[PDB]
Amino acid sequence: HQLLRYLL
Amino acid sequence: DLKSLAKRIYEAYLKNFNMNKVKARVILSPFVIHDMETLCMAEKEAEVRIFHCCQCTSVETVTELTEFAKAIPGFANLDLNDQVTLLKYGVYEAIFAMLSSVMNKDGMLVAYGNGFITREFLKSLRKPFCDIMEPKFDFAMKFNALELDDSDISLFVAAIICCGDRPGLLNVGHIEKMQEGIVHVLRLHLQSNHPDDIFLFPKLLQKMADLRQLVTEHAQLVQIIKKTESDAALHPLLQEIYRDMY
Ligand SMILES: CCO[C@@H](Cc1ccc(OCc2csc(-c3ccc(Cl)cc3)n2)cc1C)C(=O)O
């Protein structure tokens, strides 16, 4: 979950 | 303990969400989109470009929801994989609950209040795109009839996110405890904010389960569109969220 992880 | 919890959640909601119920309600009560010509002024087929527009909003809202979540007391303390699980499974439930705020029986706000797209124009797109908005209007009418304000909504949205039965959670125990705190503070808040509505709390709980079903149906329609329309890609963030969902 690259992008959600990125936001997080 | 939780004497400051409601304040923190409500403040986080006001700071992080560009649109809220007070803003949406005074704008509604904007450039009208009611046909193809108006769509192009406000703006590679039509239906496909609307589909793409909803994604943009979703992507932005998720961006806002991520920040809102980090500000929910105890949430940033969770394992980074648990924070992913929660946002992954709560995010669309939160989107359609907040989307109610910008909808009346005739249509909804778009482009930050600057636009208004009509319910009838949406209903009149070619199958299956005409099926995208109508169930959300349907849900919104009944939800908006509960006459909630932003303070209620902040707590409601927090409880949607901090949900202990999302699949694949590592620390279920802590998140169940987080949820227990939020639901408790929400119960108290509704009692003082809406004293005449005795069943409001149980009515919201019903809405939580309704939203789950609304999201399930929506993901299904999105998947149908993805596989059968050539000009219908999903943003990679949205594809992450929808992946493994069923
Ligand atoms: C299919 C994707 O749905 C999304 C979820 C979603 C997101 C937003 C949404 O409604 C906001 C909206 C509707 S029409 C519009 C618009 C129209 C025209 C212009 Cl010019 C500008 C804006 N903005 C409805 C849905 C269901 C997804 O799967 O991620």
Side-chain angles (χ1 to χ4, degrees):
Chain A
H1 300 112
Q2 54 171 3
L3 297 164
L4 204 51
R5 205 165 215 210
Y6 175 87
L7 295 169
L8 278 165
Chain B
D1 45 88
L2 38 77
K3 75 178 93 176
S4 78
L5 181 54
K7 190 280 288 191
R8 286 179 178 177
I9 284 164
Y10 187 31
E11 168 192 38
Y13 169 103
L14 290 186
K15 290 197 179 297
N16 285 115
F17 297 110
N18 79 78
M19 184 64 60
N20 62 53
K21 198 156 180 189
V22 182
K23 170 164 185 200
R25 293 290 132 182
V26 338
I27 295 172
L28 289 165
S29 332
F31 178 93
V32 185
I33 303 162
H34 58 104
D35 66 18
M36 297 297 170
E37 188 181 44
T38 45
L39 187 66
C40 301
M41 275 182 280
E43 212 134 25
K44 318 200 97 280
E45 191 188 2
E47 283 84 1
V48 161
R49 270 152 33 228
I50 283 160
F51 180 83
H52 171 265
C53 276
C54 301
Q55 286 190 43
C56 294
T57 302
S58 296
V59 168
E60 195 172 7
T61 308
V62 166
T63 269
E64 298 176 330
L65 272 157
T66 294
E67 292 305 291
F68 169 78
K70 286 195 293 214
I72 294 162
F75 183 93
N77 282 347
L78 305 164
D79 177 36
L80 214 134
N81 299 253
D82 272 8
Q83 303 180 31
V84 165
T85 297
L86 291 183
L87 279 165
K88 182 197 163 61
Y89 286 101
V91 99
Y92 274 115
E93 283 167 36
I95 286 177
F96 305 128
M98 295 189 301
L99 207 67
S100 292
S101 308
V102 305
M103 300 174 148
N104 61 37
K105 70 169 185 80
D106 298 311
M108 60 166 178
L109 294 182
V110 301
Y112 316 101
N114 293 316
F116 180 83
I117 186 157
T118 68
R119 188 166 177 180
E120 192 61 14
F121 177 57
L122 283 158
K123 273 209 212 185
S124 89
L125 298 175
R126 63 163 178 91
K127 284 152 162 280
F129 293 87
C130 52
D131 303 355
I132 305 176
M133 288 305 156
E134 185 58 28
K136 285 57 156 188
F137 279 106
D138 170 278
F139 173 89
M141 292 324 98
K142 296 168 185 147
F143 193 76
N144 287 176
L146 297 171
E147 291 191 291
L148 305 183
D149 62 38
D150 296 309
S151 65
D152 315 308
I153 300 166
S154 56
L155 294 171
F156 185 61
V157 169
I160 280 166
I161 290 162
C162 306
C163 176
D165 43 59
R166 306 302 194 184
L169 276 177
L170 299 167
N171 199 184
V172 175
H174 185 230
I175 301 164
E176 273 172 351
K177 246 62 182 185
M178 279 197 294
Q179 178 159 62
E180 182 176 290
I182 299 150
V183 180
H184 172 240
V185 174
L186 169 66
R187 192 202 286 243
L188 281 161
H189 185 82
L190 300 165
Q191 277 174 204
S192 70
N193 208 45
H194 305 267
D196 294 356
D197 200 321
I198 311 293
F199 290 115
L200 183 47
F201 179 69
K203 297 198 268 164
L204 279 190
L205 271 63
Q206 186 48 38
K207 302 302 180 198
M208 295 200 202
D210 294 1
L211 276 163
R212 302 185 79 124
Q213 183 53 220
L214 192 80
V215 176
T216 295
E217 302 177 351
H218 172 88
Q220 179 180 279
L221 185 47
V222 170
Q223 171 75 175
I224 290 156
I225 290 167
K226 203 188 90 159
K227 304 312 288 197
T228 66
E229 301 279 347
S230 45
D231 299 322
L234 282 171
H235 188 109
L237 179 63
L238 305 192
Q239 162 66 301
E240 266 172 57
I241 290 149
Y242 283 123
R243 178 156 62 241
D244 290 12
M245 228 175 202
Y246 90 82

